[PDB]
Design a protein around this nucleic acid. Structure first.
Ligand SMILES: [Mg+2]
Ligand SMILES: [Mg+2]
Ligand code: NI
Ligand code: NI
Ligand code: NI
Ligand code: NI
Lengths: 138, 142, 142, 134
DNA sequence: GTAATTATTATTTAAAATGAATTAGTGTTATATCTG
DNA sequence: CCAGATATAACACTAATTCATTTTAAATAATAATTA
Protein backbone atom coordinates (compact mmCIF):
# COMPACT_ATOMS: atom_id res chain seq x y z
CA UNK A 1 0.00 0.00 0.00
CA UNK A 2 0.90 3.75 -0.21
CA UNK A 3 0.27 4.48 3.54
CA UNK A 4 1.43 1.03 4.87
CA UNK A 5 4.17 1.18 7.60
CA UNK A 6 7.35 -0.66 6.49
CA UNK A 7 10.86 -1.19 7.96
CA UNK A 8 14.36 -1.05 6.34
CA UNK A 9 17.75 -1.94 7.85
CA UNK A 10 20.98 0.12 7.82
CA UNK A 11 24.50 -1.29 8.50
CA UNK A 12 26.99 1.25 10.03
CA UNK A 13 29.71 1.98 12.64
CA UNK A 14 28.57 2.05 16.32
CA UNK A 15 30.18 5.56 16.57
CA UNK A 16 27.83 6.90 13.86
CA UNK A 17 24.63 5.39 15.39
CA UNK A 18 25.67 6.83 18.79
CA UNK A 19 26.14 10.29 17.15
CA UNK A 20 22.69 9.91 15.52
CA UNK A 21 20.97 8.79 18.78
CA UNK A 22 22.71 11.71 20.58
CA UNK A 23 20.73 14.04 18.23
CA UNK A 24 17.15 12.57 18.72
CA UNK A 25 16.11 14.18 22.06
CA UNK A 26 17.88 17.63 21.87
CA UNK A 27 16.24 18.63 18.52
CA UNK A 28 12.71 17.84 19.84
CA UNK A 29 12.31 14.31 18.40
CA UNK A 30 10.44 11.39 20.01
CA UNK A 31 11.70 8.45 17.87
CA UNK A 32 14.94 7.54 15.94
CA UNK A 33 12.70 6.72 12.93
CA UNK A 34 10.91 10.14 13.22
CA UNK A 35 14.35 11.87 12.86
CA UNK A 36 15.60 9.57 9.98
CA UNK A 37 12.33 10.28 8.08
CA UNK A 38 12.95 14.08 8.37
CA UNK A 39 16.61 13.61 7.22
CA UNK A 40 15.29 11.59 4.18
CA UNK A 41 12.71 14.35 3.45
CA UNK A 42 15.56 16.92 3.87
CA UNK A 43 17.72 15.06 1.28
CA UNK A 44 14.69 14.64 -1.04
CA UNK A 45 14.18 18.43 -1.07
CA UNK A 46 17.91 19.44 -1.57
CA UNK A 47 18.47 16.71 -4.25
CA UNK A 48 15.47 17.92 -6.38
CA UNK A 49 16.66 18.71 -9.94
CA UNK A 50 13.51 20.25 -11.57
CA UNK A 51 11.51 23.41 -10.33
CA UNK A 52 14.84 25.40 -9.75
CA UNK A 53 14.77 26.75 -13.38
CA UNK A 54 12.65 25.36 -16.31
CA UNK A 55 13.71 23.74 -19.69
CA UNK A 56 16.89 22.34 -17.89
CA UNK A 57 19.39 24.34 -20.02
CA UNK A 58 23.12 23.56 -19.44
CA UNK A 59 24.03 25.20 -16.07
CA UNK A 60 27.34 25.36 -14.16
CA UNK A 61 27.75 23.75 -10.71
CA UNK A 62 30.43 23.04 -8.12
CA UNK A 63 30.52 19.81 -6.17
CA UNK A 64 32.47 19.95 -2.89
CA UNK A 65 33.59 16.52 -1.68
CA UNK A 66 35.55 15.11 1.30
CA UNK A 67 36.92 11.55 1.18
CA UNK A 68 39.60 9.17 2.52
CA UNK A 69 42.10 8.38 -0.24
CA UNK A 70 43.00 5.18 1.72
CA UNK A 71 39.59 3.70 0.75
CA UNK A 72 40.38 0.85 -1.67
CA UNK A 73 39.52 1.61 -5.33
CA UNK A 74 37.76 4.94 -4.42
CA UNK A 75 39.91 7.28 -6.51
CA UNK A 76 39.76 4.86 -9.48
CA UNK A 77 35.96 4.93 -9.17
CA UNK A 78 35.74 8.77 -8.95
CA UNK A 79 38.08 9.46 -11.90
CA UNK A 80 36.31 6.70 -13.95
CA UNK A 81 32.89 8.35 -13.29
CA UNK A 82 34.28 11.77 -14.29
CA UNK A 83 35.98 10.48 -17.47
CA UNK A 84 32.75 8.70 -18.48
CA UNK A 85 31.05 12.16 -18.01
CA UNK A 86 33.37 13.98 -20.48
CA UNK A 87 32.76 17.79 -20.97
CA UNK A 88 30.34 17.75 -18.02
CA UNK A 89 33.46 17.85 -15.85
CA UNK A 90 35.50 21.00 -16.41
CA UNK A 91 38.26 20.35 -13.78
CA UNK A 92 38.97 19.24 -10.19
CA UNK A 93 40.99 21.11 -7.50
CA UNK A 94 42.31 18.86 -4.73
CA UNK A 95 43.57 19.67 -1.19
CA UNK A 96 45.36 16.97 0.87
CA UNK A 97 43.97 17.91 4.30
CA UNK A 98 45.55 15.14 6.44
CA UNK A 99 46.43 11.42 6.07
CA UNK A 100 42.73 10.36 5.97
CA UNK A 101 41.12 13.49 4.40
CA UNK A 102 40.96 15.01 0.85
CA UNK A 103 39.00 18.13 -0.17
CA UNK A 104 37.96 18.30 -3.83
CA UNK A 105 35.97 20.87 -5.84
CA UNK A 106 34.52 19.32 -9.00
CA UNK A 107 33.32 21.92 -11.52
CA UNK A 108 30.40 20.56 -13.63
CA UNK A 109 28.47 21.62 -16.75
CA UNK A 110 25.12 20.14 -17.70
CA UNK A 111 21.40 19.96 -17.22
CA UNK A 112 19.61 19.55 -13.84
CA UNK A 113 19.50 15.69 -14.27
CA UNK A 114 23.15 15.38 -15.38
CA UNK A 115 24.44 17.48 -12.45
CA UNK A 116 22.11 15.79 -9.91
CA UNK A 117 23.26 12.40 -11.25
CA UNK A 118 26.93 13.23 -10.66
CA UNK A 119 26.35 14.53 -7.15
CA UNK A 120 24.56 11.23 -6.34
CA UNK A 121 26.97 8.92 -8.23
CA UNK A 122 30.13 10.47 -6.62
CA UNK A 123 28.49 11.28 -3.25
CA UNK A 124 26.97 7.77 -3.21
CA UNK A 125 30.42 6.12 -3.17
CA UNK A 126 31.65 4.36 0.00
CA UNK A 127 34.43 6.49 1.45
CA UNK A 128 32.95 9.81 0.24
CA UNK A 129 32.22 11.33 3.65
CA UNK A 130 30.77 14.66 2.37
CA UNK A 131 29.25 15.94 -0.90
CA UNK A 132 27.51 19.30 -1.33
CA UNK A 133 26.41 20.74 -4.67
CA UNK A 134 26.41 24.52 -5.42
CA UNK A 135 24.15 25.39 -8.41
CA UNK A 136 24.63 28.47 -10.68
CA UNK A 137 24.18 28.75 -14.65
CA UNK A 138 26.14 28.42 -18.06
CA UNK B 1 35.33 -0.98 20.13
CA UNK B 2 34.07 0.21 16.70
CA UNK B 3 32.25 -2.59 14.85
CA UNK B 4 29.53 -2.74 12.15
CA UNK B 5 26.01 -2.97 13.64
CA UNK B 6 22.48 -2.96 12.11
CA UNK B 7 19.12 -1.18 12.88
CA UNK B 8 15.63 -0.92 11.37
CA UNK B 9 13.68 2.25 10.44
CA UNK B 10 9.86 2.49 10.43
CA UNK B 11 8.21 4.66 7.71
CA UNK B 12 5.45 4.83 5.06
CA UNK B 13 5.98 2.65 1.91
CA UNK B 14 5.53 5.73 -0.35
CA UNK B 15 8.45 7.51 1.50
CA UNK B 16 10.83 4.51 1.06
CA UNK B 17 9.76 4.27 -2.62
CA UNK B 18 10.52 8.02 -3.13
CA UNK B 19 13.90 7.50 -1.40
CA UNK B 20 14.78 4.41 -3.57
CA UNK B 21 13.52 5.97 -6.85
CA UNK B 22 14.82 9.57 -6.53
CA UNK B 23 18.22 8.67 -4.88
CA UNK B 24 19.42 5.00 -4.46
CA UNK B 25 18.25 3.98 -7.97
CA UNK B 26 19.71 7.27 -9.38
CA UNK B 27 23.40 6.51 -8.59
CA UNK B 28 23.74 5.94 -4.80
CA UNK B 29 25.67 2.80 -3.83
CA UNK B 30 23.43 1.80 -0.83
CA UNK B 31 20.65 2.97 1.60
CA UNK B 32 23.18 2.55 4.44
CA UNK B 33 25.68 4.89 2.68
CA UNK B 34 23.01 7.58 2.38
CA UNK B 35 22.08 7.26 6.01
CA UNK B 36 25.81 7.46 6.94
CA UNK B 37 26.23 10.56 4.67
CA UNK B 38 23.07 12.18 6.23
CA UNK B 39 24.56 11.52 9.73
CA UNK B 40 27.94 13.01 8.54
CA UNK B 41 25.95 15.97 7.06
CA UNK B 42 24.43 16.82 10.52
CA UNK B 43 27.78 16.01 12.26
CA UNK B 44 29.38 18.83 10.08
CA UNK B 45 26.71 21.57 10.66
CA UNK B 46 27.22 20.91 14.43
CA UNK B 47 30.98 21.80 14.23
CA UNK B 48 30.04 25.00 12.31
CA UNK B 49 27.21 25.87 14.76
CA UNK B 50 29.85 25.49 17.57
CA UNK B 51 31.44 28.98 17.42
CA UNK B 52 34.79 28.08 19.07
CA UNK B 53 37.82 30.19 17.87
CA UNK B 54 40.26 27.38 18.89
CA UNK B 55 39.33 25.16 15.86
CA UNK B 56 40.75 26.03 12.38
CA UNK B 57 40.30 22.47 10.81
CA UNK B 58 36.91 23.86 9.56
CA UNK B 59 37.65 24.12 5.79
CA UNK B 60 35.19 25.95 3.50
CA UNK B 61 34.63 26.61 -0.21
CA UNK B 62 33.21 29.91 -1.44
CA UNK B 63 31.61 29.74 -4.91
CA UNK B 64 31.46 33.16 -6.65
CA UNK B 65 30.09 34.38 -10.03
CA UNK B 66 31.05 37.87 -11.23
CA UNK B 67 31.59 40.14 -14.28
CA UNK B 68 35.32 40.78 -14.76
CA UNK B 69 34.33 43.95 -16.74
CA UNK B 70 33.29 45.60 -13.42
CA UNK B 71 36.13 48.10 -12.68
CA UNK B 72 38.44 47.25 -9.70
CA UNK B 73 36.30 44.12 -8.83
CA UNK B 74 39.18 41.61 -9.38
CA UNK B 75 41.53 44.15 -7.72
CA UNK B 76 39.37 44.34 -4.59
CA UNK B 77 38.71 40.46 -4.40
CA UNK B 78 42.46 39.58 -4.47
CA UNK B 79 43.13 42.45 -1.96
CA UNK B 80 40.53 41.00 0.48
CA UNK B 81 42.03 37.49 0.13
CA UNK B 82 45.64 38.66 0.62
CA UNK B 83 44.61 40.78 3.64
CA UNK B 84 42.64 37.88 5.18
CA UNK B 85 43.58 36.58 8.63
CA UNK B 86 42.16 33.26 7.29
CA UNK B 87 44.33 30.99 5.22
CA UNK B 88 43.07 31.26 1.59
CA UNK B 89 44.47 27.93 0.29
CA UNK B 90 43.87 28.53 -3.47
CA UNK B 91 41.37 29.84 -6.04
CA UNK B 92 40.17 28.03 -9.20
CA UNK B 93 38.79 30.30 -11.93
CA UNK B 94 36.55 29.41 -14.92
CA UNK B 95 35.98 31.96 -17.71
CA UNK B 96 32.35 31.15 -18.50
CA UNK B 97 31.64 33.83 -21.14
CA UNK B 98 32.59 37.52 -21.81
CA UNK B 99 30.58 38.77 -18.77
CA UNK B 100 30.82 35.72 -16.42
CA UNK B 101 33.59 34.31 -14.18
CA UNK B 102 33.33 31.41 -11.75
CA UNK B 103 35.68 31.12 -8.79
CA UNK B 104 35.99 28.54 -6.03
CA UNK B 105 37.86 30.03 -3.08
CA UNK B 106 39.12 27.39 -0.64
CA UNK B 107 39.38 28.81 2.94
CA UNK B 108 40.61 27.69 6.40
CA UNK B 109 40.29 29.25 9.89
CA UNK B 110 37.74 30.92 12.22
CA UNK B 111 33.99 30.61 11.44
CA UNK B 112 33.44 34.42 11.85
CA UNK B 113 36.62 35.32 9.89
CA UNK B 114 35.53 32.95 7.03
CA UNK B 115 31.93 34.33 7.02
CA UNK B 116 33.54 37.83 6.99
CA UNK B 117 35.05 36.98 3.54
CA UNK B 118 31.70 35.57 2.31
CA UNK B 119 30.14 38.91 3.53
CA UNK B 120 32.96 41.10 2.13
CA UNK B 121 33.42 39.35 -1.28
CA UNK B 122 29.66 38.74 -1.75
CA UNK B 123 28.91 42.34 -0.83
CA UNK B 124 31.01 43.69 -3.74
CA UNK B 125 29.39 45.47 -6.74
CA UNK B 126 29.46 43.06 -9.69
CA UNK B 127 29.47 39.85 -7.58
CA UNK B 128 26.27 38.27 -8.96
CA UNK B 129 26.42 35.05 -6.81
CA UNK B 130 28.20 33.93 -3.59
CA UNK B 131 27.51 30.66 -1.76
CA UNK B 132 29.62 29.21 1.07
CA UNK B 133 30.04 25.41 1.52
CA UNK B 134 30.82 24.85 5.22
CA UNK B 135 32.85 21.63 5.39
CA UNK B 136 35.34 19.73 7.63
CA UNK B 137 37.61 16.71 8.01
CA UNK B 138 36.38 13.34 9.43
CA UNK B 139 38.06 10.63 11.56
CA UNK B 140 38.93 7.11 10.20
CA UNK B 141 35.65 5.67 11.73
CA UNK B 142 33.43 8.73 10.90
CA UNK C 1 47.56 -2.69 -33.11
CA UNK C 2 47.97 -3.46 -29.34
CA UNK C 3 51.23 -5.50 -29.01
CA UNK C 4 54.26 -5.26 -26.67
CA UNK C 5 57.57 -5.75 -28.53
CA UNK C 6 61.28 -5.72 -27.52
CA UNK C 7 64.53 -4.23 -29.02
CA UNK C 8 68.27 -4.19 -28.24
CA UNK C 9 70.60 -1.15 -27.97
CA UNK C 10 74.40 -1.32 -28.39
CA UNK C 11 76.50 1.12 -26.25
CA UNK C 12 79.55 1.44 -23.96
CA UNK C 13 79.31 -0.27 -20.51
CA UNK C 14 80.21 3.04 -18.76
CA UNK C 15 77.21 4.80 -20.48
CA UNK C 16 74.72 2.10 -19.37
CA UNK C 17 76.25 2.19 -15.85
CA UNK C 18 75.82 6.01 -15.49
CA UNK C 19 72.25 5.62 -16.92
CA UNK C 20 71.28 2.95 -14.29
CA UNK C 21 72.76 5.21 -11.57
CA UNK C 22 70.28 7.98 -12.46
CA UNK C 23 67.43 5.36 -12.62
CA UNK C 24 68.11 4.43 -8.93
CA UNK C 25 69.22 7.99 -7.78
CA UNK C 26 66.00 9.43 -9.26
CA UNK C 27 63.91 6.25 -8.68
CA UNK C 28 62.31 5.55 -12.12
CA UNK C 29 60.08 2.36 -12.08
CA UNK C 30 62.04 0.73 -14.97
CA UNK C 31 64.72 1.42 -17.67
CA UNK C 32 62.00 0.77 -20.30
CA UNK C 33 59.74 3.46 -18.69
CA UNK C 34 62.57 6.05 -18.96
CA UNK C 35 63.23 5.09 -22.62
CA UNK C 36 59.47 5.35 -23.36
CA UNK C 37 59.28 8.70 -21.48
CA UNK C 38 62.26 10.20 -23.41
CA UNK C 39 60.69 8.99 -26.69
CA UNK C 40 57.39 10.65 -25.56
CA UNK C 41 59.41 13.76 -24.54
CA UNK C 42 61.00 13.99 -28.02
CA UNK C 43 57.64 13.34 -29.72
CA UNK C 44 56.02 16.37 -27.88
CA UNK C 45 59.04 18.53 -28.89
CA UNK C 46 58.55 17.48 -32.58
CA UNK C 47 54.73 18.06 -32.39
CA UNK C 48 55.22 21.67 -31.14
CA UNK C 49 58.34 22.55 -33.26
CA UNK C 50 56.32 21.50 -36.38
CA UNK C 51 54.38 24.78 -36.18
CA UNK C 52 51.00 24.16 -37.83
CA UNK C 53 47.92 26.24 -36.86
CA UNK C 54 45.76 23.21 -37.83
CA UNK C 55 46.49 21.10 -34.67
CA UNK C 56 44.18 22.50 -31.97
CA UNK C 57 44.60 19.33 -29.73
CA UNK C 58 47.77 20.92 -28.16
CA UNK C 59 47.58 21.38 -24.36
CA UNK C 60 49.86 23.79 -22.45
CA UNK C 61 50.32 25.16 -18.93
CA UNK C 62 51.43 28.74 -18.36
CA UNK C 63 53.07 29.40 -14.97
CA UNK C 64 52.99 33.09 -13.95
CA UNK C 65 54.21 35.09 -10.87
CA UNK C 66 52.98 38.65 -10.32
CA UNK C 67 52.24 41.40 -7.76
CA UNK C 68 48.48 41.77 -7.21
CA UNK C 69 49.19 45.36 -6.00
CA UNK C 70 49.97 46.37 -9.62
CA UNK C 71 46.81 48.37 -10.53
CA UNK C 72 44.31 46.53 -12.87
CA UNK C 73 46.95 43.76 -13.59
CA UNK C 74 44.40 41.08 -12.60
CA UNK C 75 41.66 42.69 -14.76
CA UNK C 76 44.04 42.78 -17.80
CA UNK C 77 45.12 39.11 -17.35
CA UNK C 78 41.44 37.90 -17.15
CA UNK C 79 40.61 40.19 -20.14
CA UNK C 80 43.52 38.56 -22.10
CA UNK C 81 42.16 35.07 -21.26
CA UNK C 82 38.50 35.83 -22.04
CA UNK C 83 39.54 37.47 -25.37
CA UNK C 84 41.85 34.53 -26.21
CA UNK C 85 41.02 32.41 -29.28
CA UNK C 86 42.38 29.38 -27.38
CA UNK C 87 40.34 27.46 -24.87
CA UNK C 88 41.45 28.59 -21.42
CA UNK C 89 40.36 25.48 -19.45
CA UNK C 90 40.95 26.88 -15.91
CA UNK C 91 43.31 28.96 -13.74
CA UNK C 92 44.64 27.96 -10.28
CA UNK C 93 45.84 30.83 -8.10
CA UNK C 94 48.10 30.75 -4.99
CA UNK C 95 48.44 33.90 -2.82
CA UNK C 96 52.11 33.42 -1.87
CA UNK C 97 52.68 36.61 0.19
CA UNK C 98 51.54 40.29 0.17
CA UNK C 99 53.43 41.04 -3.11
CA UNK C 100 53.40 37.58 -4.82
CA UNK C 101 50.73 35.54 -6.72
CA UNK C 102 51.23 32.23 -8.52
CA UNK C 103 48.93 31.19 -11.35
CA UNK C 104 48.80 28.10 -13.55
CA UNK C 105 46.80 28.77 -16.70
CA UNK C 106 45.70 25.53 -18.53
CA UNK C 107 45.38 26.23 -22.32
CA UNK C 108 44.17 24.18 -25.24
CA UNK C 109 44.46 25.23 -28.90
CA UNK C 110 47.02 25.82 -31.66
CA UNK C 111 50.70 26.64 -30.93
CA UNK C 112 50.40 30.28 -32.17
CA UNK C 113 47.35 31.27 -30.05
CA UNK C 114 48.83 29.54 -26.92
CA UNK C 115 52.06 31.49 -27.47
CA UNK C 116 50.27 34.84 -28.17
CA UNK C 117 48.63 34.37 -24.74
CA UNK C 118 52.18 33.93 -23.30
CA UNK C 119 53.52 36.96 -25.27
CA UNK C 120 50.64 39.15 -23.99
CA UNK C 121 50.44 38.00 -20.33
CA UNK C 122 54.25 37.82 -19.93
CA UNK C 123 54.57 41.27 -21.51
CA UNK C 124 52.43 42.86 -18.76
CA UNK C 125 53.87 45.33 -16.21
CA UNK C 126 54.01 43.55 -12.87
CA UNK C 127 54.52 40.09 -14.37
CA UNK C 128 57.68 38.99 -12.73
CA UNK C 129 57.73 35.45 -14.26
CA UNK C 130 56.03 33.56 -17.15
CA UNK C 131 57.06 30.05 -18.31
CA UNK C 132 55.08 27.91 -20.78
CA UNK C 133 54.99 24.11 -20.50
CA UNK C 134 54.31 22.71 -23.97
CA UNK C 135 52.59 19.35 -23.44
CA UNK C 136 50.25 17.00 -25.42
CA UNK C 137 47.82 14.05 -25.15
CA UNK C 138 49.08 10.52 -25.91
CA UNK C 139 47.13 7.63 -27.55
CA UNK C 140 46.72 4.18 -25.81
CA UNK C 141 49.82 2.79 -27.70
CA UNK C 142 52.00 5.92 -27.08
CA UNK D 1 84.31 0.93 -21.40
CA UNK D 2 83.46 -2.06 -23.76
CA UNK D 3 80.33 -2.29 -26.00
CA UNK D 4 77.41 -4.19 -24.36
CA UNK D 5 73.67 -4.56 -25.26
CA UNK D 6 70.32 -3.98 -23.46
CA UNK D 7 66.65 -4.72 -24.24
CA UNK D 8 63.64 -2.35 -23.94
CA UNK D 9 59.98 -3.51 -23.83
CA UNK D 10 57.40 -1.12 -25.44
CA UNK D 11 54.38 -0.75 -27.80
CA UNK D 12 55.03 -1.25 -31.55
CA UNK D 13 53.59 2.22 -32.37
CA UNK D 14 56.08 3.88 -29.94
CA UNK D 15 59.08 2.12 -31.57
CA UNK D 16 57.64 3.09 -35.01
CA UNK D 17 57.36 6.74 -33.72
CA UNK D 18 61.06 6.50 -32.57
CA UNK D 19 62.31 4.89 -35.83
CA UNK D 20 60.80 7.83 -37.83
CA UNK D 21 63.23 10.23 -35.97
CA UNK D 22 66.50 8.50 -37.24
CA UNK D 23 67.12 9.57 -40.93
CA UNK D 24 64.93 12.72 -40.41
CA UNK D 25 67.49 14.09 -37.81
CA UNK D 26 70.76 12.75 -39.40
CA UNK D 27 71.49 9.42 -37.64
CA UNK D 28 73.08 6.15 -38.90
CA UNK D 29 71.33 3.66 -36.49
CA UNK D 30 68.51 3.40 -33.88
CA UNK D 31 71.22 2.74 -31.23
CA UNK D 32 72.97 6.04 -32.23
CA UNK D 33 69.79 8.09 -31.51
CA UNK D 34 69.04 6.15 -28.23
CA UNK D 35 72.63 6.76 -26.97
CA UNK D 36 72.39 10.49 -27.90
CA UNK D 37 69.01 10.70 -26.11
CA UNK D 38 70.53 9.03 -22.98
CA UNK D 39 73.48 11.49 -23.19
CA UNK D 40 70.93 14.38 -23.58
CA UNK D 41 68.84 13.19 -20.59
CA UNK D 42 71.93 12.71 -18.37
CA UNK D 43 73.08 16.34 -18.95
CA UNK D 44 69.81 18.24 -18.02
CA UNK D 45 69.24 15.90 -14.99
CA UNK D 46 72.69 16.90 -13.59
CA UNK D 47 72.26 20.73 -13.72
CA UNK D 48 68.76 20.29 -12.13
CA UNK D 49 70.32 18.15 -9.28
CA UNK D 50 73.08 20.75 -8.47
CA UNK D 51 72.82 24.40 -7.03
CA UNK D 52 70.62 23.50 -3.92
CA UNK D 53 69.76 26.81 -2.13
CA UNK D 54 67.88 25.85 1.08
CA UNK D 55 65.38 28.78 0.53
CA UNK D 56 61.52 28.58 0.44
CA UNK D 57 60.88 28.04 -3.28
CA UNK D 58 57.55 27.35 -5.05
CA UNK D 59 57.32 24.92 -8.01
CA UNK D 60 54.73 23.57 -10.46
CA UNK D 61 54.85 20.00 -11.69
CA UNK D 62 52.88 19.35 -14.90
CA UNK D 63 51.99 15.68 -15.42
CA UNK D 64 50.11 13.65 -18.07
CA UNK D 65 48.94 10.10 -17.35
CA UNK D 66 46.39 7.42 -18.31
CA UNK D 67 43.82 7.01 -15.52
CA UNK D 68 43.16 3.46 -16.89
CA UNK D 69 46.57 2.45 -15.38
CA UNK D 70 45.39 0.41 -12.32
CA UNK D 71 45.34 2.60 -9.13
CA UNK D 72 48.04 5.02 -10.56
CA UNK D 73 45.83 7.92 -9.34
CA UNK D 74 45.73 6.42 -5.78
CA UNK D 75 49.58 5.98 -5.77
CA UNK D 76 50.13 9.65 -6.81
CA UNK D 77 47.84 10.92 -3.99
CA UNK D 78 49.67 8.58 -1.50
CA UNK D 79 53.06 10.13 -2.50
CA UNK D 80 51.62 13.67 -2.11
CA UNK D 81 50.02 12.94 1.30
CA UNK D 82 53.33 11.37 2.48
CA UNK D 83 54.97 14.89 2.10
CA UNK D 84 51.69 16.85 2.70
CA UNK D 85 53.06 20.18 4.08
CA UNK D 86 54.89 20.75 0.73
CA UNK D 87 52.03 20.05 -1.76
CA UNK D 88 49.83 23.18 -1.87
CA UNK D 89 47.09 21.83 -4.24
CA UNK D 90 46.46 19.86 -7.47
CA UNK D 91 44.33 20.87 -10.48
CA UNK D 92 43.16 18.01 -12.69
CA UNK D 93 41.84 18.10 -16.29
CA UNK D 94 40.20 14.99 -17.82
CA UNK D 95 41.47 15.48 -21.37
CA UNK D 96 40.13 12.34 -23.10
CA UNK D 97 39.53 8.63 -22.25
CA UNK D 98 43.28 7.89 -21.95
CA UNK D 99 44.65 11.33 -20.85
CA UNK D 100 44.70 13.25 -17.52
CA UNK D 101 46.50 16.56 -16.95
CA UNK D 102 47.57 17.58 -13.46
CA UNK D 103 49.33 20.66 -12.15
CA UNK D 104 50.86 19.96 -8.76
CA UNK D 105 51.89 23.13 -6.90
CA UNK D 106 54.82 22.33 -4.55
CA UNK D 107 56.58 24.34 -1.75
CA UNK D 108 60.05 23.90 -0.20
CA UNK D 109 63.83 23.81 -0.61
CA UNK D 110 65.51 22.36 -3.75
CA UNK D 111 66.16 18.95 -2.01
CA UNK D 112 62.60 18.39 -0.67
CA UNK D 113 61.10 19.55 -4.07
CA UNK D 114 63.25 17.13 -6.15
CA UNK D 115 62.31 14.24 -3.77
CA UNK D 116 58.56 14.69 -4.48
CA UNK D 117 59.03 15.44 -8.24
CA UNK D 118 60.96 12.22 -9.11
CA UNK D 119 58.60 10.01 -7.03
CA UNK D 120 55.69 10.87 -9.45
CA UNK D 121 57.39 11.04 -12.90
CA UNK D 122 58.99 7.65 -12.22
CA UNK D 123 55.56 5.94 -11.93
CA UNK D 124 54.42 3.50 -14.64
CA UNK D 125 51.64 5.20 -16.65
CA UNK D 126 53.00 8.76 -16.12
CA UNK D 127 53.66 9.68 -19.76
CA UNK D 128 54.89 13.27 -19.13
CA UNK D 129 56.37 15.23 -16.19
CA UNK D 130 57.84 18.76 -16.46
CA UNK D 131 58.77 20.91 -13.48
CA UNK D 132 58.72 24.68 -13.34
CA UNK D 133 60.95 26.18 -10.54
CA UNK D 134 60.55 29.78 -9.18
C1' DG E 1 -6.14 -4.92 23.31
C1' DT E 2 -3.47 -2.15 18.32
C1' DA E 3 0.35 -0.50 16.02
C1' DA E 4 4.58 1.59 15.50
C1' DT E 5 9.41 1.24 16.85
C1' DT E 6 13.64 -1.23 18.14
C1' DA E 7 16.47 -5.42 18.40
C1' DT E 8 18.08 -9.79 16.72
C1' DT E 9 18.96 -13.30 13.32
C1' DA E 10 18.88 -14.79 8.12
C1' DT E 11 19.65 -14.29 3.45
C1' DT E 12 21.47 -11.75 -0.41
C1' DT E 13 25.12 -9.23 -2.25
C1' DA E 14 29.39 -6.82 -2.59
C1' DA E 15 34.08 -6.30 -0.99
C1' DA E 16 38.66 -8.41 0.16
C1' DA E 17 41.97 -11.78 -0.23
C1' DT E 18 44.28 -15.67 -2.30
C1' DG E 19 47.08 -17.73 -5.95
C1' DA E 20 47.60 -19.57 -10.60
C1' DA E 21 48.21 -17.51 -15.40
C1' DT E 22 49.91 -14.23 -17.75
C1' DT E 23 52.74 -10.27 -19.04
C1' DA E 24 56.28 -6.96 -18.71
C1' DG E 25 61.26 -5.98 -18.02
C1' DT E 26 66.13 -7.21 -18.52
C1' DG E 27 70.12 -10.18 -19.29
C1' DT E 28 72.19 -13.43 -22.67
C1' DT E 29 73.23 -15.44 -26.91
C1' DA E 30 72.89 -15.24 -32.00
C1' DT E 31 72.16 -13.43 -36.74
C1' DA E 32 72.05 -9.42 -39.66
C1' DT E 33 74.35 -5.38 -41.23
C1' DC E 34 77.99 -2.22 -41.72
C1' DT E 35 82.63 -0.17 -43.37
C1' DG E 36 86.81 0.09 -46.28
C1' DC F 1 83.66 -12.60 -50.95
C1' DC F 2 86.96 -10.53 -47.20
C1' DA F 3 88.12 -9.38 -41.93
C1' DG F 4 86.59 -6.82 -37.93
C1' DA F 5 83.35 -4.37 -36.20
C1' DT F 6 78.74 -2.74 -34.35
C1' DA F 7 73.57 -3.07 -34.82
C1' DT F 8 69.53 -5.58 -34.49
C1' DA F 9 66.93 -9.79 -33.89
C1' DA F 10 65.86 -13.74 -31.42
C1' DC F 11 65.68 -16.25 -27.19
C1' DA F 12 65.68 -16.89 -22.03
C1' DC F 13 64.77 -16.10 -17.69
C1' DT F 14 62.98 -13.10 -13.68
C1' DA F 15 60.12 -9.67 -11.43
C1' DA F 16 55.71 -7.82 -11.92
C1' DT F 17 50.97 -7.54 -12.92
C1' DT F 18 46.29 -9.67 -14.31
C1' DC F 19 42.36 -12.38 -13.70
C1' DA F 20 39.28 -15.91 -12.07
C1' DT F 21 39.08 -17.89 -8.06
C1' DT F 22 37.75 -18.40 -3.03
C1' DT F 23 36.90 -16.09 1.10
C1' DT F 24 35.11 -12.64 4.03
C1' DA F 25 32.27 -8.73 5.24
C1' DA F 26 28.67 -5.54 4.44
C1' DA F 27 23.77 -4.47 2.96
C1' DT F 28 19.09 -5.63 3.02
C1' DA F 29 15.13 -8.77 4.17
C1' DA F 30 12.66 -11.13 7.46
C1' DT F 31 11.10 -11.76 11.82
C1' DA F 32 11.04 -11.46 16.71
C1' DA F 33 10.87 -8.51 20.72
C1' DT F 34 9.81 -4.39 22.68
C1' DT F 35 7.97 0.25 23.50
C1' DA F 36 4.05 3.86 22.69
MG1 LIG G 1 29.24 8.28 0.57
MG1 LIG H 1 56.32 7.33 -16.43
NI1 NI I 1 44.51 14.41 -0.93
NI1 NI J 1 37.10 34.74 -16.26
NI1 NI K 1 47.11 36.07 -4.95
NI1 NI L 1 41.27 12.70 -15.52
Amino acid sequence: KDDSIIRFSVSLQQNLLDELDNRIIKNGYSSRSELVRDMIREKLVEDNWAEDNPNDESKIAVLVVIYDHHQRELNQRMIDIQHASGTHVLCTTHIHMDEHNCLETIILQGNSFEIQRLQLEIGGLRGVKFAKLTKASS
